Design a protein around this ligand. Structure first.
Ligand SMILES: [Zn+2]
Ligand SMILES: [Zn+2]
Ligand SMILES: [Zn+2]
Ligand SMILES: [Zn+2]
Lengths: 267, 267, 267, 267
């Protein structure tokens, strides 16, 4: 296929449609999160979804049942540990052999950091870099070969506003550094796969996935004052961007980054 | 307080739906320009569109008919010269009087340059900055007052990759400077309107709007070889991004920028 | 085409030297402002300096005197209205007449904004843009013609961190937008003038030039908490960067921006 | 923890003076490399210098000798492999024992890639990221603990324009991604160390250090055409920036990045 061409559909609803297409999402281990929302969004567009999980399948199992019943499409859960290449490589092979192909890939690897560079050990640093950065690298290289053989494809990497600025007052340089590298990874791969696939990243700000309770009320109040919209976001506010990049509504966008932080980076 | 809240919808389709909402597009007036595509994408989502033209009206009148028969929505053409604040103030006052209110405004100040600031005159500069920068300011300020009075709103300014980088073959700093100011104006206003409205921008690259012949067939050759995707972009590949920022599919994203240059700003 | 070559000096001290060279600074009008500090530094490196003033002859004249007796170099003040292209074209003409040339030009003209685009009038907006954006453009175009004729030059425009983010809580979009245009103006001109001159920008964060009394004590504290260094900057903390860009100590750096904001933009 | 205060000096020369200060450069071990240039510049300002090497002990030994003889300062070489934290931790230890302190640390990791993600193996990726990314982390973490104890310091990390864009001819995503992380590491640490030290980065473009023969001639012309200055930079054009960040001529700069690429990123 001589390079990537523009959508054949003049209709937005046909550009966004994922019918006849296969999309795979990483996290989606719980009925509440960025990965499950991306899964629901793509599914709503008639997409056959393939969500993965790290340790326990319970969460994925149900997400699939909920995905097939409410959207009436085909779905399946797979075990995948991004920190391991062979794991990712296995994911692709198994998803391709099951669904027959992979059209879009949503990668959301986000292991947090609990300290600064000095207070933290080396192990602490490597954990974040190995999962957040290298983990993204693993998924990309896994689907990359499949995209090259089909001459089509869309890789959406989930980065973070932490890849733009440094969070305060919590210190998490390792996370920021990993996420920043993730953003540029999108740019560089877009240029590398310029002949067959599109690559773009989403940089979420403070999105409440359901764990706010494990955070000091004062800390949250301190964050909201820094967020011009003065509130946390909800994962369902990302599905749009997720579907946008995965579908044919962005056949000319590649190497881009979309900020969704309620205007945080703006200040 | 309250102010700037998340979508009430979980369904992506519902978040994208513009039924019941009024969106105005300034560019729209040509056959395949960025403006008519935005109105097309918005109209397809069930929105009542108000498009504007600068001089001749034959084009926007025809577009209004097109929009009404292919999407069954109400639309009307208005004469507006972004360079004049009164024209924009009248534009807003008129649409609201004809449609009830404005839910989303898409600015599209498109005036190009033809030289550097040295070869060009002071007039040449004032032209670009007045139409592309101040003009966008006029539209923004004009609808902002409405948005504030209502307590809601979404402003989508059409910037350009030229606000990120400087096109090589041809010199056009005045245009580039104007567009960059446009990009930050979106982040700056997202923060000023953080209590009632969102503001975001799109930075298009080389999009073929139907003026291929008015550009040296030899200058384009260079472009085609400098764009990773190796081809011009199509206005129909921008409707997705326009609808995204105009609809409720992005209630937590404000002050962000979306590049659509086929990977050009990647190298 | 003369083309831009690397400094012929190996020694840093020699690269920083500005002996046998002429420099012009537009701010130098007060005791401890960014302008006068920019001049003192250049004069220290042994350079003839031309400073300008908007209408404060007394102050500038005092600056000229102190500059000579302390640096043993030639100095002279001129009246310049950056908002007027003729004023700038004149400034250059005069300087080239008295000093015989201009090797480096430091653009500095701050026209603070007193409100957001909604509270301010179109006039207010136009003034800030005319002085801050178009003003810088006027100095660039004025001196550019001279650099092109000499095949050598170095422009250093003083932007602001405000061109990167939006100050809080004070609203000043007109000021931020202008400064934003100033930053990309440096990038665009660096390319436009590539064959004969360098262009770069400095983005000052909160610097105290002796006017802190105009800002409420309560607002000063809010700012300091937002500055990781937790303090205001001093004009003398920018002279190194000004001299850095004005001298041969940066003959390969063009189209770059240097933030001196105590880390304010980091968050 | 005396807080980072403004330089006490008013003179730029005093500010730039590193007499009584110790600096350490990791690259320095060759004739005209970026590292040795950084050493030379600091040596010329009157600083005690310590350079490291990974294997070329001979070259380092001679640089020391040459350093002490022309500048009359104390210099010594140390073996240090940045990919090992223990080696870095030991570097800081020994230097602080021999020199008594460390005021400025210039980090540098030159490991390069020779293929993209798909062609390269997981090992090739890991190697670059470990040396380039984690290596810079190692250095930072090592000196950081010392800076904190002294309540003063300045870290300068050598990144690359590859952290901002993706090189066209060659495919080197691992390098690009790694360099990108370095840039943000500087921002992040600037904030984390906001109480005792300053952190900043330099992003070089095509800088010919000598190996301008191992590259095909036709390849050189292609790059040179993408560089506004149309030439490769020389290592001696970076000593200005290295000394700028390491000295008291930038006591308010932190979290800033400086591009020195002949305007390459401008386009
Ligand atoms: Zn472990
Ligand atoms: Zn005119
Ligand atoms: Zn570029
Ligand atoms: Zn910020």
């Amino acid at each position: 296929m001589p390079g990537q061409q523009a959508t054949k559909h003049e209709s937005l609803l046909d550009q966004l449609s994922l019918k006849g297409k296969v999309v795979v999402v990483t996290g989606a281990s719980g009925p509440k999160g960025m990965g499950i929302e991306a899964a629901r969004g793509c599914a709503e567009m008639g997409a056959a979804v393939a969500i993965t999980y790290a340790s326990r399948a319970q969460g994925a199992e149900e997400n699939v049942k909920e995905l097939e019943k409410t959207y009436g499409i085909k779905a399946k859960a797979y075990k995948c540990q991004v920190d391991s290449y062979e794991s990712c490589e296995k994911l692709v092979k198994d998803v391709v052999a099951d669904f027959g192909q992979i059209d879009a890939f949503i990668a959301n690897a986000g292991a947090t950091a609990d300290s600064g560079i000095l207070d933290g050990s080396v192990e602490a640093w490597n954990h974040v870099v190995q999962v957040d950065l290298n983990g993204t690298f693993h998924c990309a290289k896994a689907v990359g070969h499949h995209f090259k053989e089909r001459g089509t494809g869309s890789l959406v990497i989930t980065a973070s506003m932490s890849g733009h600025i440094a969070n305060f007052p919590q210190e998490q340089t390792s996370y920021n550094v990993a996420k920043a590298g993730c953003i540029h990874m999108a740019r560089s791969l877009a240029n590398e796969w310029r002949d067959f696939a599109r690559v773009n990243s989403i940089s979420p700000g403070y999105i409440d996935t359901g764990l706010s309770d494990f955070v000091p009320k004062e800390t949250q109040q301190l964050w909201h004052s820094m967020i011009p919209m003065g509130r946390d976001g909800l994962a369902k506010e990302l599905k749009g961007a997720y579907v946008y990049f995965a579908s044919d509504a962005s056949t000319y966008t590649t190497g881009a980054d979309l900020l969704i932080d309620g205007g945080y980076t703006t200040r």
